[PDB]
Subunit: 598 residues, 3 copies
């Protein structure tokens, strides 16, 4: 007997008996069986003789973490703890199937990581691409197997070491789950980098039930080299982001960074706070990514978020390839409170709550976006920020509905003249959208709704001001190049009495058979001489399209009154019947509500 | 001394000393004390001699799990881990108080289960009833004690083994918490079954603070035998479901399955995604379940959910027994984006966003439902689905308010003719509800708002179209059997110019003293011969109820104009004063806005 | 050799070898290394000889918990478990930097507490102040260092022992995180006390990323001595409360308790349920607390909560000190369903959904509150509760917008006469707010919108009733002392036909140049004798301000008709042109819609 030698060997714990709480009905086990119920990096962080190695800036922990993942996977899975109170440095690339993804660690199905300590990237990675955790098992994703049931969670940290990108063409990621099913990241802080993304869920539609919750993403763009950034990229359905925090402090992030991109159906972005980013969320169906879950992005939800951004909050898109056409529909944007941060006009991408953006090539005639509801959001831009819109409508739009929002910025609807000429269908701006007054007196030469489109059909614009802004050129203007048909355009009279122009139709498009319109105008009239009931007629003949008009002015006169209400005549005059108590030709200038078919 | 024998016995770990991290200020303990801080199924999964047994398809793990729960309960509670990397099969029924509930495992207060591995049901259960985890301690719930402080959580799985029900009368459940206080399920996947429910919280109002969060429920209906299904049943107050995922793929689920039923006050269903179900949520006060928390369901919230369903999204109800009357009030439905999945017309229960349903016996005259707010939701049904409504209003309704929703389906308000004749009070349809155009041109013979009721009082219907649909018979129709009083009914003129019928009152109900109405109509008028101010009068005498009317048509004429505005006469003609520049009898057909008291 | 003595000593576990699962590639460790991966109170709950002490009502566990926290902190952090199945009593105050805060336990950075058992306060604390867990390290917070990365979580309980406050001037707290960065409380129940707060996040703006989630707060006010209570106090930015439950049962809580106060920018309160409280949430920028995060509270969100309260749901405020001015802006209140619980009129603070409150001194002329959006909420008060308002507007207001809410209570807008005289700008009440009928017939002598202000500018009140209430004195009244300018005030005619007074302007303020108004009135008219087109004129001369008016009454007559539409004359009469088929002086009383500039 050297029981003593056994006890001191690595098998010693397998010889020391244990029964839970001295319970005679419990299993008769050995200490090693109970200790085997859990597993940490420490169980693999050793030299070839089995001696534990201390982590630190001059130790590459990657091979030890991989060994731990590879082993737990072999037993059907479990959860490996990355211990608290230590920083574990990664200092070399992985090998095999993840090498094509500049992968550091390969994730494996059913193997969870409980990250309590800190994972840091060593300077080996400075100026290089990297993707810290990769779930593909093959360089070519199309030939990759899946990652299932893989969760990363804890109070720990992933720190990208502050290193800048070496070249704009490089990619960097934190967690690339691959073709991912029931995978998640919960509680982790991702910080201190220059990366493309922090987490990507799914791969071109392949994946399901992937989620990012209660995570923090802090200072993840730091250079002019970085081409682009979207902090969480959701590229599988039935997946989303909730209750996260996103913050950036570099100037470059104001111009290139987006918090989330939702690229597949039944995805969501909720209850998060964003600060310092260019963009809130892209909601898009890219044809080039339609392989796993179909050609439609539908059931897309952006809800109850708080954002301070420099560019656009939600960007809608869809596009085509030679062989696939992408479609976007059935979207809700609700409950968000968003502002454009303090900045000079035009110093960052054009500020907007909703942007209908062109494709990556800049095409504006490929999109099929419809059945979008934008409701119960607030938006605010400071008064100096000329380039701020409720919606920048820069590409073809097949429908978008606004109800009960509060927009307080320079423009309501905008698209630049002399740029794209979008085809617009089913734009619905309900009268319950409240138009703020922060930009009152700043709108010289500007149209509040600047309808710079090829055409508008089946649309509703119900303008309601809630304060005066006599600087604006018009509440709404259509250039002559914009066709307008089967539409309803109204300007409420409140706060408009002193406006020269309320609604402007540069091609007289309001005359159209199925155009329904009402807006204030000032009209000069003259009556016949007759005592008693007497007609008054407009001097100008521009009113052939008017079905009725009524007075918005008081009558200062005792001896006569103009008509309360007017119709038209074939020559384009208005006509109504007033009353001369005493006879005489009368001449008056009156403010009328002009109406056509309403 | 055989210290050696002691060390190798089950008491051995109780003789090996330990002090945390060699800290001289730490407790001097033994290894067994530290190991006793945690507990797993392995500590009870043993034969009568204490030898561990491996789980698997031919091992019934139920008695061992029960022993573990029973023991931990005896020490005031704790958390038992069901280890990862193993499947633990259940293969027999429990005994005692849960036997009346076809119970497998009895839950006990303060004893949590951390389910990391998989729990599977063995074929013993095929064609039989079962309720996997039961929190009652008595066959009769009325005599049951409570379950408190019992949480089930982890990354693990409950798999129901795919077995079909043996008979429609059978019940099956996953987690029946019983009379449950501060109990929860978090993170678990429930899959592969034919069950009635996955989780039930509470028992006829008894319970509090019970929640289902971040769970998945997948393929839990699979046969024509299954009578009914509601995945999470909330039958105690201050309780709810959030951030879950629900999916079904069988045809039968499209016809019988609901994701959630909320049956008591201060309950919620939020931030979840549903696919493949008949129904989203029932929100109901069943008198037969009013014992623990009173006769009122109030503070009911369904918010920010994503759903593809085949029948109805939210179903409202209340009913009575011989001795109790149930009441439903103070409900909010908001932020939801819901569609009816691709299906033939009438191939599944009638598609609806809100259904006011009859009781289980089919009675429509027992309900007391009021103070419901439906706001900021989207709803869409494909164009072929005739049986799609914003609201199917099939039983008595004491109030429901719609504001700022987007409904894009066949009907807005519907109830079938020749079925129930509901009594309707306080139905409020605000003008900010946007009516979509997906079903344009499909509505031959149909009324968009088909008011097939006994009576309507204290209601508001403000119809606003946003595109043309000249196929419809009318925007809104009241049959002569429907009384209408103290109500406001308006049809906006936009997109209505070519409609023969806009609003239709088959019993001339718009004449009522306290009916306030406006809608377009085409009216033929004829004038007197007189040069100058001249009256025009309607040919028909159907307008005794009209307080004013105004022109919606242009005047093609030079030599005269009809009145811009009209009143009536006792004989039912309209009359207004136009103008003849030259004399002559005039005859015109004009589109007017008819108004009564507005 | 006494290997035996080594094995039985506290170093024994450090001599027993272990290799994970017998894996030859795993680290060769000792049992003590694996046991050192975790830590509990048991590792410090010992006498000076190292013998474990059992917790209980006669053991003060404070020094042992502190030793554990102090030690784990020294190794860079980790998580200490407070074991399940035991109650751990605290029975003395802490010492050092927390003594000035009546502190019991000092929290330390990176040291988490996993509270599974129960923490109770011993009677030592009866009638005394206490703050159970404190994160400051100094008596003076301005000289305190920070607390970082400190999370408290588990299924456990903090029980305050039921003790009443000894004096109103005392303070009590559960968790005072101090100057707190990335700190949280998750899952804990706080119960059975008389305290000021349960959790405070941050200190006068210092802090970030602090959160309270899935916690319960039960019966935390119990005496008339308690001065005030706010259950969670958020005093750092990028921080909030979600998915919590709050309940009180004492009468005193109905009068003094608030669930949440949000005091810094980018903070949120969501998805929670409140019962038995006076107040939901204060949303305020207190100048006296502006040191760490600036003088502005902006991006404040209160969303998707369920509440039964006795006073006010959301209270807005801002104030000044000698040297700082606080500002409140960019607030959203949405998706909440709130009611005033059953109580007598005036038996608790005045019931309101939104209150614009004076400062703590009662000043109403210091506030700078603007860009608030209140949308898609429900509110209900029982019919007897006279003191219930959608908004009690008691201090200066620079803007608040209401869209698509359902308010069912006594008043819509209220402020008491003979109290404060607020200056109001940019109050926007959209026509999509639905006014309920619960208080119909209770409003004798009352104005639904009682505009008891110094002045109103740039505001919109669009009144729409949905049932009759002929008890009210007026839908909206402005006293002569209230100036009114650049505003839009409309009363829809539905349900108003029998009202003597609809809108009332006691100083004839509707005459103002930039006041835009429309409301029903009854007007007596008389015509001239003339056969044919004939003028009708109002008897009264009160209509100099009317731009147009139109009939809301039918014409019972055959031989004549009054004008459909009217304008005015300089003498203040209305005039229109009707028609006498037969001649004669006519005299009629008609209901008109009076309009000014709309």
């Amino acid at each position: 007997d050297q029981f003593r030698a056994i006890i001191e060997s690595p098998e010693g714990a397998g010889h020391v008996g244990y029964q839970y709480r001295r319970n005679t009905g419990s299993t008769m086990r050995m200490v090693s069986d109970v200790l085997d119920e859990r597993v940490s990096l420490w169980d693999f962080h050793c030299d070839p003789s089995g001696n534990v190695i201390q982590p630190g800036p001059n130790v590459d922990s990657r091979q030890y973490l991989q060994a731990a993942i590879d082993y737990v996977s072999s037993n059907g899975g479990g959860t490996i703890t990355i211990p608290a109170g230590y920083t574990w440095y990664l200092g070399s690339y992985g090998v095999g199937g993840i090498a094509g993804h500049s992968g550091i660690i390969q994730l494996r199905s059913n193997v969870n990581l409980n990250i309590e300590g800190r994972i840091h990237l060593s300077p080996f990675f400075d100026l290089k691409p990297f993707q810290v955790f990769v779930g593909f098992d093959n360089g070519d994703p199309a030939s990759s197997g899946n990652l299932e049931n893989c969760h990363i969670y804890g109070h720990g940290v992933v720190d990208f070491g502050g290193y800048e990108f070496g070249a704009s063409s490089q990619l960097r990621n934190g967690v690339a789950f691959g073709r991912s099913y029931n995978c998640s990241v919960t509680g982790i802080t991702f910080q201190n980098g220059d990366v493309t993304w922090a987490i990507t869920l799914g791969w071109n539609g392949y994946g399901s039930n992937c989620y990012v919750r209660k995570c923090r993403f802090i200072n993840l763009v730091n250079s002019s080299v970085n081409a682009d950034h979207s902090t969480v990229y959701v590229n599988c359905p039935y997946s989303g982001v909730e209750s996260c925090y996103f913050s950036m402090s570099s100037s470059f992030a104001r111009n290139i960074a987006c918090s989330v991109q939702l690229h597949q159906h039944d995805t969501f972005y909720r209850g998060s706070t964003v600060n310092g980013y260019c963009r809130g969320a892209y909601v898009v169906m890219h044809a080039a990514e339609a392989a796993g879950a179909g050609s439609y992005a539908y059931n897309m939800q952006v809800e109850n978020n708080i954002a301070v951004i420099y560019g656009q909050f939600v960007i809608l898109g869809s596009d085509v390839t030679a062989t696939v056409s992408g479609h976007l529909n059935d979207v809700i944007v609700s409950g968000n409170i968003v502002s454009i941060g303090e900045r000079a006009a035009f110093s960052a991408p054009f500020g907007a709550f909703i942007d209908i953006g062109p494709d990556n090539s800049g095409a504006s005639n490929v999109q099929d976006i419809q059945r979008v509801l934008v409701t119960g959001n607030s938006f605010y831009a400071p008064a100096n920020i000329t380039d701020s819109a409720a919606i920048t409508l820069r590409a073809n739009l097949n429908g978008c509905t606004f109800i009960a929002n509060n927009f307080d910025c320079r423009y309501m609807v905008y698209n630049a003249p002399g740029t794209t000429s979008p085809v617009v269908q089913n734009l619905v701006w309900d009268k319950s959208n409240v138009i703020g007054g922060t930009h009152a007196n700043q709108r010289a030469g500007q149209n509040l709704f600047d309808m710079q489109f090829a055409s508008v059909v089946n649309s509703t614009i119900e303008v309601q001001l809630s304060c005066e802004d006599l600087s604006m050129f018009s509440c709404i203007l259509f250039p002559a190049s914009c066709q307008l048909s089967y539409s309803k355009i109204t300007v409420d009279s409140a706060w408009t009495k002193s406006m020269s122009n309320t609604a402007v139709f540069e091609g007289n498009q309001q005359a159209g058979a199925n155009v329904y319109v009402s807006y204030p105008a000032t009209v000069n009239l003259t009556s016949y001489n007759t005592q008693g009931a007497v007609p008054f007629f407009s001097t100008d003949t521009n009113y052939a399209w008017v079905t009725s008009a009524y007075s918005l002015s008081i009558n200062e006169n005792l001896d006569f009154s103009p008509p309360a209400t007017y119709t038209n005549k074939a020559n384009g005059q208005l006509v109504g019947v007033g009353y001369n108590e005493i006879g005489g030709v009368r001449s008056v200038s009156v403010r009328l509500m002009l109406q056509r078919q309403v």
